[PDB]
Amino acid sequence: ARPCIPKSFGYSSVVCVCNATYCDSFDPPTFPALGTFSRYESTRSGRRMELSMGPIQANHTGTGLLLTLQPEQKFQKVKGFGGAMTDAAALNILALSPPAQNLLLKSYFSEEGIGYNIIRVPMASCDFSIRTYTYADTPDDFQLHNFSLPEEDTKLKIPLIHRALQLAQRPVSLLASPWTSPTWLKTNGAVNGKGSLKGQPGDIYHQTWARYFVKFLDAYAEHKLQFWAVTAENEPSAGLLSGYPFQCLGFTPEHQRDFIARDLGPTLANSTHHNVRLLMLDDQRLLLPHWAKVVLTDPEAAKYVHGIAVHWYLDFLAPAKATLGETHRLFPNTMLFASEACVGSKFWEQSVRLGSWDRGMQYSHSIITNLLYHVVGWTDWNLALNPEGGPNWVRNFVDSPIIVDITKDTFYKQPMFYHLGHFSKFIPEGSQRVGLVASQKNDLDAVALMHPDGSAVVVVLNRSSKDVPLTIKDPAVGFLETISPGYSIHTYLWHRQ
Numbered sequence: 001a002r003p004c005i006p007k008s009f010g011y012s013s014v015v016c017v018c019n020a021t022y023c024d025s026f027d028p029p030t031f032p033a034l035g036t037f038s039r040y041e042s043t044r045s046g047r048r049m050e051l052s053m054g055p056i057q058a059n060h061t062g063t064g065l066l067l068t069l070q071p072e073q074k075f076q077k078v079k080g081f082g083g084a085m086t087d088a089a090a091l092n093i094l095a096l097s098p099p100a101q102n103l104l105l106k107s108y109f110s111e112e113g114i115g116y117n118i119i120r121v122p123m124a125s126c127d128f129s130i131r132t133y134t135y136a137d138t139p140d141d142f143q144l145h146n147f148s149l150p151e152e153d154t155k156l157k158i159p160l161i162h163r164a165l166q167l168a169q170r171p172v173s174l175l176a177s178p179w180t181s182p183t184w185l186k187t188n189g190a191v192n193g194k195g196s197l198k199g200q201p202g203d204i205y206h207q208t209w210a211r212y213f214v215k216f217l218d219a220y221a222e223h224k225l226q227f228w229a230v231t232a233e234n235e236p237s238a239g240l241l242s243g244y245p246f247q248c249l250g251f252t253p254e255h256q257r258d259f260i261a262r263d264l265g266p267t268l269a270n271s272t273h274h275n276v277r278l279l280m281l282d283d284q285r286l287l288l289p290h291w292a293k294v295v296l297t298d299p300e301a302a303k304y305v306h307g308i309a310v311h312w313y314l315d316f317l318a319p320a321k322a323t324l325g326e327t328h329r330l331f332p333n334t335m336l337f338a339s340e341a342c343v344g345s346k347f348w349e350q351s352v353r354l355g356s357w358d359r360g361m362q363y364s365h366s367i368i369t370n371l372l373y374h375v376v377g378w379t380d381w382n383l384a385l386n387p388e389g390g391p392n393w394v395r396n397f398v399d400s401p402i403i404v405d406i407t408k409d410t411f412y413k414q415p416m417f418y419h420l421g422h423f424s425k426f427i428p429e430g431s432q433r434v435g436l437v438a439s440q441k442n443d444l445d446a447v448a449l450m451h452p453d454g455s456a457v458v459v460v461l462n463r464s465s466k467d468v469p470l471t472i473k474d475p476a477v478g479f480l481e482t483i484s485p486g487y488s489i490h491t492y493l494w495h496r497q
């Protein structure tokens with residue numbers, strides 16, 4: 001339906017300008033006969049998920065690279081795509097006038113937007129909060145009689161999540177993660193720095209902590225919200241580093257194991273919330289395969305772990321094949337999920353760069369690498385930030401796909417939002433990654449998937465400056481002659497019968 005309104009802030013590409021009366025959006029999804037494909041194209045030059053169609057022909061006029069769909073080569077099924085409703089994202093969204101809020105929510109959650117079906121939710125304060133708090137701040141309340149939700153949940157987070165879910169087509173899955181416990185459960189009695197739970201797994205501190213998860217799930221369920229899954233702790237390794245500035249809670253891989261086996265696993269299993277899944281790690285892939293070896297070789301722990309959550313931030317330090325591929329080799333039945341799909345992004349640049357094509361490219365390149373290394377799901381960090389990359393009570397280092405200007409009742413959809421959308425919009429939950437063979441060495445990032453109804457989706461990323469002639473073969477349909485322009489991303493979609 002409505003086109004992108006471009007604006008330049010002096011970076012390599014444009015943002016799309018939205019406000020209370022206008023946002024760029026899509027017509028309800030509509031797909032052509034066998035023999036025809038749809039192509040969605042974004043370019044550095046300014047095109048934004050622009051749709052064209054053409055033929056899938058019986059004869060091959062391409063003399064360059066060929067990608068061949070191999071539907072009989074079948075891999076992981078996809079859980080999905082989303083981001084995080086941090087207090088910072090909620091405050092930024094709620095600083096818009098209500099009709100602008102809806103245009104923002106539709107942008108992410110509607111079929112007329114990009115089809116998000118996962119929301120990550122922090123269990124209390126993190127660095128993207130304006131203040132420190134947990135749900136049980138009164139000391140020595142080991143039965144947690146004074147557990148409650150603040151304004152942050154009941155006023156900002158929960159309403160925005162209800163509104164996301166009304167907007168969404170697909171069922172949305174909720175994922176929760178803790179940053180810190182009550183500080184009276186901690187060896188350092190502080191929200192941050194080097195500090196663990198007091199005592200040992202099995203004790204009163206660890207039982208109380210495990211019970212807090214259940215209290216949180218009960219509280220959200222009073223608000224008629226249920227969780228797909230919880231992670232065992234956000235960035236547990238951060239809590240082992242002295243002076244760590246953000247909310248945290250240290251677990252060694254061994255402590256995580258024992259806490260799971262002794263406390264979190266049995267407590268959740270013993271609650272009415274026993275269908276909620278558990279993801280271990282929620283941290284840098286550099287920590288793999290080790291962390292998974294420690295936790296998952298102990299069957300009293302492993303029986304409670306459904307998946308392994310990873311963060312992207314420090315990916316450049318550790319190859320996908322050594323970490324993700326190696327972990328899959330060893331525990332092929334434990335899913336890999338990107339719970340904090342965020343990098344960012346060069347000590348000599350600002351937090352937020354409006355219209356950065358490069359940061360876009362980094363998102364899609366990273367989703368593609370993940371997909372080729374068995375990852376089933378991706379949750380971006382903050383849904384929305386202000387232009388200084390906040391609020392953050394400690395310090396901003398990261399960009400966001402939507403940047404909200406609260407002085408102008410306007411929001412900016414960054415190139416990152418469209419790189420994401422090239423995946424989230426066209427890869428519904430249950431989609432299976434399938435084979436896609438390059439005929440010769442090339443510079444493109446490419447992946448193929450089959451929808452639950454058997455139709456084909458292919459994304460092609462060109463991170464070079466130069467146009468690449470391309471043919472895509474489907475053995476069941478024919479050849480698709482196309483071109484990958486320099487600095488573009490294409491999503492191709494087609495019926496297979």
Ligand SMILES: *[C@@H]1O[C@H](CO)[C@@H](O)[C@H](O)[C@H]1NC(C)=O
Binds near residue numbers: 005018019020
């Ligand atoms: C919102 O954006 C639309 C599209 O540019 C524009 O025509 C309208 O003037 C905007 N509203 C305000 C208050 O700027």
